[PDB]
């Protein structure tokens, strides 16, 4: 599977994954809010944005 | 990557003093950047920190209207002004680089500040 | 949010050390843990509960769910030997909050 893997508003790159769900997860630390996209679909810690999607390069 | 804090000395209660922190190594407006002192003997007390563009600025409670945290990309460096200066703010005072989650990934070898009479 | 950690902790070399970070719902939050020795500056030896930055000994091991954080160092060396800082972030508050420090004395 092809998912996003650029890092909050970086420029857009992609990776191949075995994996069937991408995911874009989203945070506040002192920097801002910070985006971080890869394969799979984790657990995140309460609070947390998540977003898991089942398409190619829908974690945009 | 490195970071050197300077600035530090013997000042009176009720004092000021401006801190310094030179970076290099990285682009350094894209990392938010933190103040933490220890007091001789005790623990990490974090004091301040600042986003990449200066736009958001954070302050421990023992600290808010005393300090100010500010930062200059041009000669990419980060500041601590500390005014109306206790006993209790004799520390050695560390910047450090943030990362994920407010991590702390790089730290100077700290500037010491030392409050009496 | 009060985090206590144990002041000291004393452990025979090749044994288990497990520096613990208590508070309450720590487990929703994300933990960081630093090593400082005398006279250096603080090293991130873990990051997020369980990540390790590169070039820290897989020894090193971050576990953190319920009201306990622990930060584990498996085959402790003598070189082990410094204060342990537990730090906690949260994403619904600003405020950087440290633990009061472990020393670790790696028993020679």
């Known amino acids: 599977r092809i998912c996003y893997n650029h890092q909050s508003t970086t420029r857009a790159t992609t990776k191949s994954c075995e994996e069937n769900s991408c995911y874009k997860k989203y945070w506040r630390d002192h920097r801002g809010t910070i985006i971080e996209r890869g394969c799979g679909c984790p657990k995140v810690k309460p609070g947390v944005g998540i977003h898991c999607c089942q398409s190619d390069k829908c974690n945009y | 990557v490195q970071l050197q804090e300077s600035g530090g000395g013997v000042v009176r209660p009720g004092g000021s003093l401006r801190l310094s922190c030179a970076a290099s190594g990285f682009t350094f407006s894209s990392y938010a950047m933190s103040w933490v002192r220890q007091a001789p003997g005790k623990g990490l007390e974090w004091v301040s920190a600042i986003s990449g563009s200066g736009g958001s600025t954070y302050y421990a409670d023992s600290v808010k209207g005393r300090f100010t945290i500010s930062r200059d990309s041009s000669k990419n460096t980060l500041y601590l002004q500390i005014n109306s200066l206790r006993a209790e703010d004799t520390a050695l005072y560390y910047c450090?680089?943030?990362?994920?989650?407010?991590?702390?990934?790089?730290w100077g070898q700290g500037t010491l500040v030392t409050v009496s009479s | 949010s009060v985090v206590t950690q144990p002041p000291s902790v004393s452990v025979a070399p090749g044994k288990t050390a497990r520096i613990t970070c208590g508070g309450n719902?720590?487990?929703?939050?994300?933990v960081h843990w630093y090593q400082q020795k005398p006279g250096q500056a603080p090293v991130l030896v873990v990051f997020?509960?369980?990540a390790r930055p590169s070039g820290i000994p897989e020894r090193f091991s971050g576990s953190n769910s319920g009201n306990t954080a622990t930060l584990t160092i498996s085959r402790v060396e003598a070189g082990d030997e410094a204060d342990y800082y537990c730090?906690?972030?949260?994403?619904?508050?600003?405020?950087?909050?440290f633990g009061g420090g472990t020393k670790l004395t790696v028993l020679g």
């Open positions: 719902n720590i487990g929703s939050k994300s």
């Open positions: 997020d509960d369980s």
């Open positions: 730090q906690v972030w949260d994403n619904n508050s600003d405020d950087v909050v």
């Open positions: 450090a680089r943030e990362g994920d989650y407010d991590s702390m990934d790089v």
